[PDB]
Structure formats: C-alpha cells, structure tokens
Amino acid sequence: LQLRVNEKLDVENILKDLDKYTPKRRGWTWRQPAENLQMGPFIYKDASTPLENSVALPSAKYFGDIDPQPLPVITTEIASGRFEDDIRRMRMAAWHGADHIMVIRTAGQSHYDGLIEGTPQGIGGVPITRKQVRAQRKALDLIEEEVGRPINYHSYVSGVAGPDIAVMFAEEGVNGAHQDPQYNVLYRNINMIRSFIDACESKTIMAWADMAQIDGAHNANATAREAWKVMPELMVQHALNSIFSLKVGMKKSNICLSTVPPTAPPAPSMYLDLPYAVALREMFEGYRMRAQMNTKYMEASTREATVTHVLNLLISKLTRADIQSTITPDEGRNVPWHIYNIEACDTAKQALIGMDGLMDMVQLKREGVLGDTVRELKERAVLFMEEIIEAGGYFNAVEQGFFVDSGYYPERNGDGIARQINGGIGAGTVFERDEDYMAPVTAHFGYNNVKQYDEALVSEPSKLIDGCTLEVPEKIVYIDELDENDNVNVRMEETKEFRSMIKPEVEWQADGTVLLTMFLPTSKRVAEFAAIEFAKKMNLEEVEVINREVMQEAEGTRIELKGRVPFSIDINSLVIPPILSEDEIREDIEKTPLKIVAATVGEDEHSVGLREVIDIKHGGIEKYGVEVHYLGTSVPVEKLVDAAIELKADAILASTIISHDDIHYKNMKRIHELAVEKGIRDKIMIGCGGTQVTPEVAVKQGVDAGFGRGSKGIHVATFLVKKRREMR
Amino acid sequence: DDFQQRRAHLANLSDEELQTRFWEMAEKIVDPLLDLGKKNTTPSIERSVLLRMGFSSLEAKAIVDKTMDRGLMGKGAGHIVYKIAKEKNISVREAGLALSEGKYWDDAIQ
Numbered sequence A: 001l002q003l004r005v006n007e008k009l010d011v012e013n014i015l016k017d018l019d020k021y022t023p024k025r026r027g028w029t030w031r032q033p034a035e036n037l038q039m040g041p042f043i044y045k046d047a048s049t050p051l052e053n054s055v056a057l058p059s060a061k062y063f064g065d066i067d068p069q070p071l072p073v074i075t076t077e078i079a080s081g082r083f084e085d086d087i088r089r090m091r092m093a094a095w096h097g098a099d100h101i102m103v104i105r106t107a108g109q110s111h112y113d114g115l116i117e118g119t120p121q122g123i124g125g126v127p128i129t130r131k132q133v134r135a136q137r138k139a140l141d142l143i144e145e146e147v148g149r150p151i152n153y154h155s156y157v158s159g160v161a162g163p164d165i166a167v168m169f170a171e172e173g174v175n176g177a178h179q180d181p182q183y184n185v186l187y188r189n190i191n192m193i194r195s196f197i198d199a200c201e202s203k204t205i206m207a208w209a210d211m212a213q214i215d216g217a218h219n220a221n222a223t224a225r226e227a228w229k230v231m232p233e234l235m236v237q238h239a240l241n242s243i244f245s246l247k248v249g250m251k252k253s254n255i256c257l258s259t260v261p262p263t264a265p266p267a268p269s270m271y272l273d274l275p276y277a278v279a280l281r282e283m284f285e286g287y288r289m290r291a292q293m294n295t296k297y298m299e300a301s302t303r304e305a306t307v308t309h310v311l312n313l314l315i316s317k318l319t320r321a322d323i324q325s326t327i328t329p330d331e332g333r334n335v336p337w338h339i340y341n342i343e344a345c346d347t348a349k350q351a352l353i354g355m356d357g358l359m360d361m362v363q364l365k366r367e368g369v370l371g372d373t374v375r376e377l378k379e380r381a382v383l384f385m386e387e388i389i390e391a392g393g394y395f396n397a398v399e400q401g402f403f404v405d406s407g408y409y410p411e412r413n414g415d416g417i418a419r420q421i422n423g424g425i426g427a428g429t430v431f432e433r434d435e436d437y438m439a440p441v442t443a444h445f446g447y448n449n450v451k452q453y454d455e456a457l458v459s460e461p462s463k464l465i466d467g468c469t470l471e472v473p474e475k476i477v478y479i480d481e482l483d484e485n486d487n488v489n490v491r492m493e494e495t496k497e498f499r500s501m502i503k504p505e506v507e508w509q510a511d512g513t514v515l516l517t518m519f520l521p522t523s524k525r526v527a528e529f530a531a532i533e534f535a536k537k538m539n540l541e542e543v544e545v546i547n548r549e550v551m552q553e554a555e556g557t558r559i560e561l562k563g564r565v566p567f568s569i570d571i572n573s574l575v576i577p578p579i580l581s582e583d584e585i586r587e588d589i590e591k592t593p594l595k596i597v598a599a600t601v602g603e604d605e606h607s608v609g610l611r612e613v614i615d616i617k618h619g620g621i622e623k624y625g626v627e628v629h630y631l632g633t634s635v636p637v638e639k640l641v642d643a644a645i646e647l648k649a650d651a652i653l654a655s656t657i658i659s660h661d662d663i664h665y666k667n668m669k670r671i672h673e674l675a676v677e678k679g680i681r682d683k684i685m686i687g688c689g690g691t692q693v694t695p696e697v698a699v700k701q702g703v704d705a706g707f708g709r710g711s712k713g714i715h716v717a718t719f720l721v722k723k724r725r726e727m728r
Numbered sequence B: 001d002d003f004q005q006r007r008a009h010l011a012n013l014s015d016e017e018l019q020t021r022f023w024e025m026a027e028k029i030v031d032p033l034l035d036l037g038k039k040n041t042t043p044s045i046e047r048s049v050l051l052r053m054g055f056s057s058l059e060a061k062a063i064v065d066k067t068m069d070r071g072l073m074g075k076g077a078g079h080i081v082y083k084i085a086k087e088k089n090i091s092v093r094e095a096g097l098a099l100s101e102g103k104y105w106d107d108a109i110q
C-alpha cells in the first residue's frame, strides 16, 4: 500500500517500523518471455513482458512511446554511501528498465569479522546492515509493485564473515549475491583454509534462500597487466567456484559466471573477445552467464564508454547472457551520478531491442579461426587444471603464484600473488569438528551429530529448538542503531529544509553538484586552468576538471568540469506559463481540403525564404498536404490579391526580404487594404514574413499573422488550420 | 609455446573428452576443499549458527569469543548453548545470554 506515480517516495515514512518488516518474497526472479509480442507497429522475437509503468527511450515518441523490454535481467549498481538517497535513484532506474539493483559494500567490508548494525555513512559503497537492507527491500517491494515487474535485490557475501551476512541476507529476502572463496583469498588476502571452509556454509545458506550467485572472476580482469592474456585463468576460476558450488547443493541454474569481455578498442576487441565468450559458454553449458561490461579500458569520456558497452552488448547478443549487468558511462570520471545509471539502463535496453532477433539473420562461423581459437583456449585451461594437480592441489598452486600472474598461461612471468596457507587474515581460526560436534539449525553444511540427541531429527536438525530463524522469523534479533550521530536519522534532519526549495544534486539531496562542458581554443593544459576560472566566475564551488580531450593540439580542447552551486531557488518564486501535433495538422487538410496562394511581393527577387516554408525539403506547408499555387518573385500588390480570387483560395501568403524605407511592413498594408477594398478580407486569411519581420508589427498592418527570422513549415500550417477553425 | 609441447597430449582428444577432462580435474581439485568444510569450523560459521538460534551479532561474538578461550570450538557453539539450556533446564535464549556473560562455562567443560 502507497506509491502514486506523481508523488515522490516518502523516504521518511519508509524508515518507520523497520523492526516489523518482512520481505514480501524470497529467491531470484527471471523475466517473463513474450513470444511474438506486438507493440505498436512491430513484432518482437526476443522480448519479455512489458512494464505497467516505465520511461521509454527518447525516440520512442516516434512510435507511440512503446517501451519494449529485452529477455535478460538488466542490472544497475547503486550505492553512494547514503543508501537513503540511493532509494530514490532505484525508483528512477527501475522505471528505466532495471530489475536487478546491486548494492556495493562500503570500502573494506570483507574484513568486518561479523555483521554490523544500523546506518553508518559509507565510503565508496553502502555499509551492509539488517536495518539498511530492510529499508531497501521494503522500498523495492513498492517500486516493483509500481513498475509491475519483480526487482532482484543484490549485495556481497564476500569476506571473513560470509556465513554471517549469508544468514541475514537469507532472512531479509535478498535475491542475489556474490560469493567466491577465491575472491577472498586472491584480492583481500583472507586466509585460504578458512575462506573455503566458510564458503561451504555461505553457499548452503544461499542455496536455501534460492539466491542467484554471481562469481568473482571479473576481478581477474581488473588485476591483469594485459586483460587479453588472462583468459585461461578466468576459465579456471569460473570452473573451481562452479563445481564447488554445485557439490555444496547449489542449483546448477543459480550459479552465474561474472564474465566481462577482456578488451576494448583500439584493441581489435570483437576478434579477441568473441572466441573466449563462445568457448566459455560451450565449456560451461548449464551454468548461467552474467555478462558484465568493461571497466578496465575506460576513461573520462562517457561517449567512449557507451561505444564500448554496445560492443559489449554485441558479444552478449552474439552468444548468450542470462543476466546482462551494466556500467555507468561516467564510471571512469566520478562516483556514479543519478543521470548516468539511467544512461546505463537506457543504453542496455536500446541496443538489445535494436538487436531483436538478430540471430535469425546472423550466425557464428563456428569453423574457421573462431573454432580453432575456441579450441586452443579450452586446451590452455585444461593445461592450467593439470599443473594445479601436479603441484599438489589448489592451496599449493596459490602458494606458488599460479594466480594473478601477468603471463598468458602456460606462460608464467612470476609476478602473481602468493598467499601462504598458514598466513592471511583469519590465519589460525580453523577448528576441527569433534565426534560430538552439533549444530541445531537449518542449512548447515558440515558434519552434524544430531543422532546423538535424536535419530529421527537428522533431516530437520532445526527441530531440536522448535525452528531456527529461517523457520521462525520472530526469533530474529533486530538492532536499530549503535552509533548515535552516525546514523540515517541524523543525516536526514540535516536537510528537512529541502523536503520547499530546490537545488541540483548528483547523488545526495541538495549536494549542489552540476556538470559543465566547454571547448577552448588553446592547448590542453592552459585551457584546463582557463576553464576552472570561467567556472568560478560562474559562481561555482569546489570546481574541478573531470575530463579533458584534445581536438587538436593548437586549435582547441574539450573540457568538462564538476562544481557545486552555492544557492537554491524557490519553486514558488518561479514564473511558469501554463501543442498542435504533426498528425493533427495533416488530418485537418483532409476532412476539409485546403488551398493557398503564395508570392514574393514588391520588387523582391529573393525567392529563398518563402520557398523555405513551402518546399517539403524543410517541412514546409507542402509536407502537410496544402495546395500551393506559387506566383514567383517581383509579384505585384494585386496580381497576388487578384489570384486568391481567380483561383478560389482560403489564404494569401507573401514575403518581404528587402527592407529599405520599411518597404516590407509597408506592402502588407496595401495587401490588406486591397483585400478589403475588393471584399475578400473576412472569409480569407492573410499572412506574411521576411528577414526583417516580427509577428507583432504585422498584426499592426491589418494582416492576420506574422512570421519572422526562423519560421518553419510547422509554424505556418499550424496557424493556417487555426484561423480557419475560428471563422470556419 | 612451450604451449605447443604442453598441449601435445590433448592434441587428439575430441571436444567432449577435452571438456569432461576439464571438469574431471576441476572436481579432483575441489574435493579436498569441500572435505575440509565437512570436518571443521570457524568463528563465523559458529556465529552464523548462533544467529539462526536467535541471538544478535553482539551476543554471537560474545559466545564464540568465549568458546574459543575454553578450547570448546570443536563441540560447536550452538551445541554448547543447547546442552546448557537443557541441563540447567532453561531456554536456548536464557542459556545463551547467560553464556555470553561468562556464566556456565564451568559446567560446560564437563
């Protein structure tokens, strides 16, 4: 209950009663298929069920604002440090097509040896707590009621306290999450023994909750000297995590591979990345493909980022993607803004719909260079498996730097990351289960001696205590806050003020940030400092240059800047004036056919402008089906006046270009005077225009409507059916 | 390549041999890892048990911290809380709060 399209989200009210909040549902949801789905004039071969409410692409206006949705779950990453600002962004993206919202954790959460509580402020992510998760899911339950399609909510289970987060996530109905033992070992130097003993329980809890599981392999792209050499390693990592998760009980159809195409132009990226994609998908038949986008080969140009994301999407379309995740185009430039998550989702939706049913017309030449390379990659990865075995196992191979090595396996440069089996965070916190070890709950992985307390309860070890929190949700302990200044509550009294004024933001309410794009006719360095000056001279604060592209060394430089705006504006103190369509006009001149007489009057030889508003070339009255009987140039006062008569016309239209002695505004007179002086001036209309002509000093000449510098055909035709829907 | 003389023994495998070999070995690698998770535990696995039994993160750290100090991890933090609840005829909840404050660790060592 709540949520109307035109009323903002009551963020205040959502935080109320969180202690009494239950997730409306559990597990992951895919999108619905829509066989031969018709939308407007088109049939779609790869679409999903449409949304009840959404925001269609801009050029959807030319097709009845149809907003078709592709078959893959579209992801968006939202997490700015203040989850309560984020909620508002989620509703934005949700309407723009996103049904998978992924919240990155606050910097370093892996190292938190336990859950945390309440709503501390984050950095580079949101601190993940039971309160903050309840808030977002509660809010999303509304946003998915509104848009009319379930949204999967997603965060991370990584770190030394996976079992912990996994319990809370399973409880609070989180739908998907990352969990990869290898992630903790290679990138957070968590101790390898305890990382893997832990993942068994993590993955079992997520198997229970029916969560989608994404793996960590996309981190091997980030950490590689050259990404186009890491593929044999990716394969190994995708494999070790998958076969591990399968055997823990996780469903083969809930196990997703985080797979980013390794390169970007100017690298011949399709050529390099298409075989790996094909290879991986053949070799990993059965598992789900979670396609991610490029972040390694990226910079401050959002245009460049978008161009590479479309080729990224092309890889997914030429192969397959169960989940198609996104990256905001400004990613390499600043922490993601509201507008750029919406660029992300728009881009994804548009390119995929643009490729609808492409595979009924395009197919992979699977035999040729493509097929050979697919082979070779499989073989390198099989070799990689073999050397891991020959060296005594996984732990040994990690001890030996098999991983994160800048070589192209089997090449080994000897610069990979070595972790010590007995070393790392959480070293020496591994305990052996005793013969009488026991664990009284649902979803425990390892040895569990229930039969000592009751043979019959072995398959429901939770009964020993009449249900655990997975069965009995009231047994859960809610905690509101622990810090008392570092909480959402404080942060939001901090700006009750704006929640009846208004100012710009990029992530947080009234953060005042805005983007300035300019070109300057000088070297890149000079202009960089030049821009900051114009910026301050524009009253902007905290100015900094966020992107700089050369047009040419001497001629000029593209510069983009962010700055804060040091003042607000009242919506109340804004003055705002309270659309005759293309189709409304073409249709009038059908029910009631219409005709015109046009000429360039005086001794005016200029024919260009008059012609400009008649010739269909530039959408002149001609386009709309008006009958035009042109008379030429130098046409005299009367020959034009006589004509409307001699031809039976519903309007005269004349132009004046030459202006000396006010010859223009002048002629409109003798035209209106000789239009009444004859007796046509009340069942006819009369319009004129020219270089020097204002629609005002034109009504003050007797003629009905004026048209000045910059008048298109739309302006004339719109008027010609209006001054006729009054008289007639 | 190196690679050439490395791949030599795969040269003649069919794609299916090659793929099933890929997975055969993956599984050979992870088996000793999964077997470690059956036979052992950790502070976070044990805390995660306590969360399921109805204790807060705060209360769970408290119990496991103390469980490690008494060299009792191998019996199971939840098993500890359960046996005590039974023996001193209280509630799983009471026994926990109790244990998290230092009471009963004596009785548990037997």
Ligand code: B12
Pocket: A603, A604, A605, A606, A607, A608, A609, A610, A612, A613, A653, A654, A655, A656, A657, A658, A659, A660, A687, A688, A689, A690, A691, A692, A707, A708, A709, A710, A711, A712, A716
């Ligand atoms: C190239 C040019 C010429 C061309 C004309 C091209 C042709 N065959 O049609 C020729 C023909 C080469 C020419 C001749 C001269 N012209 Co001349 N011509 C120009 C110039 C540079 C082009 C303007 C143009 O083509 N307009 C482009 C269109 C898109 O704009 P527009 O004409 O204003 O029309 C728009 C609006 O007016 C409106 N509109 C216009 N009419 C109508 C009618 C209706 C019904 C509606 C709804 C809308 C509408 O919609 C149009 C598009 O938005 C202009 C300078 C200028 N920029 O005004 C002069 C200019 C108008 N002509 C000028 C002059 C001086 C001359 C000459 C006398 C110069 C000389 N030789 O000594 C000669 C003689 C004039 C003559 N013989 O009649 C002067 C005007 C002097 C004055 N204000 O009295 C101008 C202003 C240039 C200048 N500053 O010297 N020149």
Ligand SMILES: Cc1ncc(COP(=O)(O)O)c(/C=N/CCC[C@H](N)C(=O)O)c1O
Pocket: A104, A105, A106, A107, A108, A109, A110, A111, A156, A158, A159, A178, A179, A180, A183, A188, A215, A216, A218, A219, A258, A292, A325
């Ligand atoms: C498997 C895993 N665990 C934990 C963390 C980070 O969380 P912490 O700081 O260690 O607590 C990461 C982060 N890297 C990916 C970023 C977004 C990306 N583009 C995405 O696809 O997910 C990770 O990948």
Ligand SMILES: C[C@H]1O[C@@H](n2cnc3c(N)ncnc32)[C@@H](O)[C@@H]1O
Pocket: A116, A117, A118, A120, A482, A483, A484, A486
């Ligand atoms: C610095 C931080 O430590 C936490 N924290 C954990 N326990 C307490 C406590 N008893 N009092 C205050 N903060 C606490 C947070 O949730 C926090 O923001």
